[PDB]
Structures are given as structure tokens and as C-alpha cells.
């Protein structure tokens, strides 16, 4: 059985039943059954959101290289007002999140379509709706679940790297990759900063502190700039 540390003993609460189980829990956060049940859904939702976000950022830079993703919320103008879009998103997200939360706390209780009584999701597990949500499932379910959780973890780390690279270099993912490929020995984080007992140098925050959006002055500070190496 593959593990995050070959030759180590996995935790007792991690028996390898859940997909993506590699015996990684040094803090013992998943020891409780209810906590593990909640964290499983949290990881699945985080994985899917990060996967969609990373794919969207890459496609955004490929299709629109002149638009920075970090500035995408500012330099995008639509006939629909920002407050109207926020209201639409709030209502739709509230509806779907309440339905998902109710399915989590009460399994097999919101599988029925409230509009049409002839549509109902078949019995499933928490975090894996299926039915109308899965019109095509090519391959084994367990193998695909492992692939999904692994791709989701990679995408989560990728989004964190996207944010950090955008705050340190001020460029997109493809732009940062090209900049690093041009001079690999002088573009890493080690080449940009270093800390010693006599001096502590950190890279400057390329993101401006304030952003003017229709006369509102939205503050945009780099994530934990003081703790930057």
C-alpha cells in the first residue's frame, strides 16, 4: 500500500478505506469520526474548486494574455452591474450550498427535485452525488475517485503557488514559467530572497496596496508580506 513516507507506520484512524488514503495525518486531525466525515467533504469541495480555478486561470492567460488574472476582478466590465452579479451569485451559491450542507448532515434527504416530483437522485454517498451530476463515468469508480483527489490536491497547491507567484513577481502562471525558464539559476525564490542573523531581505510586493474600483478604494495587500522570507 502506497504511503506518504515509505517504511513509516500510518495512523490508526487511517485504514485505507477512503480514496486517496496515504496515511498522512501527523497532527491527528482525522482521529474523530465526525470531524473526518466533515473534513472529507471539505477536501472534496476544495479540490474541485481549486481544479476549476487553476484550469480557468491557465485558459484565461492563454486566451487573454493581456489581462492579468489577479486584476481580472477589476478590469472586467459587463452590462450587468457588480452588485447585481454579487446578488445573483449569492442567491445561487446559497441555494446550492444549503442543499449540499443538508445532504452532509442528513444523507438521503435532499435527493428529490423540489420542482418536478419525477426526478430524484439515486442512493449515493456524501460528497459523491451522481445521478444527473454524473451522466458519463468512463472507468472504475474507485480509480477515478483516487485520480480526482490526487488532481485536486495538486490543483490546490497549484493555486497557492499561483497566488504567491502573482504577489511576488506580478505575472501570471505561464508568464512566471517563461521567466523562470529563461534564467533558472536566478529566478527561484532562493535567488530572490535570503535571511541571515545580520540581514533579512524580502522581495517587494508587486501588488499595489490600494485599487480604485468605481470610487471605492479596495485594499489589496500581499498575503502575510511581513512573514515573507
Amino acid at each position: 500500500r502506497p504511503l506518504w513516507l515509505p517504511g513509516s507506520t500510518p495512523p490508526a484512524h487511517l485504514k485505507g478505506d477512503l480514496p486517496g488514503d496515504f496515511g498522512f495525518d501527523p497532527l491527528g486531525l482525522g482521529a474523530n469520526a465526525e470531524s473526518l466525515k466533515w473534513f472529507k467533504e471539505s477536501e472534496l469541495v476544495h479540490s474541485r474548486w481549486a481544479m476549476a480555478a487553476v484550469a480557468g486561470i491557465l485558459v484565461q492567460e492563454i486566451v487573454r494574455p493581456d489581462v492579468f488574472w489577479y486584476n481580472a476582478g477589476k478590469e472586467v466590465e459587463s452590462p450587468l452591474g457588480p452588485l447585481g452579479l454579487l446578488a445573483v451569485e449569492f442567491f445561487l451559491m446559497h441555494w446550492v450550498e444549503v442543499r449540499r450542507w443538508q445532504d452532509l448532515r442528513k444523507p438521503g434527504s435532499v435527493d428529490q427535485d423540489p420542482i418536478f416530483s419525477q426526478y430524484k437522485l439515486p442512493p449515493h454517498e456524501v460528497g459523491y452525488p451522481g445521478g444527473v451530476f454524473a451522466p458519463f463515468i468512463p472507468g472504475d469508480l474507485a480509480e477515478l475517485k483516487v485520480k480526482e483527489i490526487k488532481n485536486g490536491r495538486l490543483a490546490m497547491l497549484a493555486f497557492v503557488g499561483f497566488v504567491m507567484a502573482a504577489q511576488v513577481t506580478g505575472k501570471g502562471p505561464i508568464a512566471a514559467l517563461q521567466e523562470h525558464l529563461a534564467d533558472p539559476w536566478g529566478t527561484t525564490i532562493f535567488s530572490k530572497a535570503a535571511v541571515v542573523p545580520g540581514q533579512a531581505v524580502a522581495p517587494p510586493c508587486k501588488i499595489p496596496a490600494s485599487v480604485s474600483y468605481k470610487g471605492i478604494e479596495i485594499p489589496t495587500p500581499c498575503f502575510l508580506q511581513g512573514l515573507w522570507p
Binding site: 515509505p6 513509516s8 533558472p184 536566478g186 532562493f190 542573523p197 545580520g198 531581505v201
Partner: protein, 227 residues
Amino acid sequence: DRKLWAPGVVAPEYLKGDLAGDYGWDPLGLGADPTALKWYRQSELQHARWAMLGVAGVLVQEIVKPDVYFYEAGLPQNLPEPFTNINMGGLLAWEFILMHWVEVRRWQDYKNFGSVNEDPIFKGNKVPNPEMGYPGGIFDPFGFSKGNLKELQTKEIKNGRLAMIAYMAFILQAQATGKGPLAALSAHLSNPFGNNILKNIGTCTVPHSVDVQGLTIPLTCLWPGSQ
């Protein structure tokens, strides 16, 4: 019985001569704990091999490049072509990643003996690893382990201890005279009564700090000598 580290001294109970190069020397009793003894043996082997490599590197470097000081060879401007004036960040990144991988593998081997012998990518590529700190196989392609491994291990630990003492000697000689081991030996051979530890001591030739490209690295001697 084996010869101890001193005439008339009594070896400790835990030092029965099982390990190579055992002289019953433990004035601090640090080897009383078996787990601590195994960890200290691994640490001694690592120090021995690294010190042997350092001593050989300093000697070969002084022979091939006598115009380059080994103490200041770490500066980017003293690096050979085409690594001269290279970015130290990328170099540190390369070393950190590679050394971190190999040291984590070695550490896991120490925690769980015989559990990381197999290659994680190409299955079937394993090392025999008869004892801790002695992997063998790909690490010994010439096959010198199929014989008296005890005397060879004794030779290795003794040469490593001698190299540890020698490397510290090189460091103090460079910090007190400002020259390499061969240069210090030649200087002492020129006038033994004029160039020795009686007059070279008390002076620290190492500067206060050095500006490596952009950041400054503080430096100091092992003893409070005159800067």
C-alpha cells in the same frame, strides 16, 4: 582481548567490541542508551565520510589549483568556469533539494531498517543493506564487500576519525595563518622555530563579515584571536 584506548583503563559494559574500531572509549557515557548509541554510530559514520571527502578535496584542490585559497573558495567570484559569479540562490536550491531527498531516505532507513532499499520508480532495484550505514549494492559497484568486512570497516572508521581531526587542523591552520595545509606545512618547513603555533596563535585572519553578492554573511574564528 582488544587493545583499549589507555593502559589500565576498563572498557564500558556496552562496548564489547561488536562495532568496528572499538577502543572502549566513552568518558561521558553517551553510549549507555542503545538507541542513542546507534544514532551516534550513524552520526560518526557520516562525519567520518564527509571529513574524508573534505580533506581529500582540500589537498587535491591545493595541488591542482595552488593559487586558490580553500577558505575563500566558497565565494562566487572564486568559482571556476562556467560557474563564476553565478547566482548562489539557484545553487543552494539545487543542493537543498538533492541533499534533502537523500538525507530523508537515509533517515527513514535509520528509523525503519530495510524499508527504503527498493527504488521507488523502477521496481526491482534494491540494495542489500546488511547493516545500518552500509547500504552496498549500487553504492559498492566494485564488489569489495564480499570479504572481510570487519577489518575494512575498522579501516574506514579509523581513517575517518583521522580525517576529522585533520580537517579541524586545516580549519584552525587557515584561521590562524591565512593559508592552506600544504602552504602552512611549507611555511613551517622554511623556519620551524619561527612559524608555529607559538606565534601564529592569537591572530584571526578571517574578516568580520563578507558581502556575498547582495547579502552579508558574518564570519568568526573558533577562538577569540586578533582580527
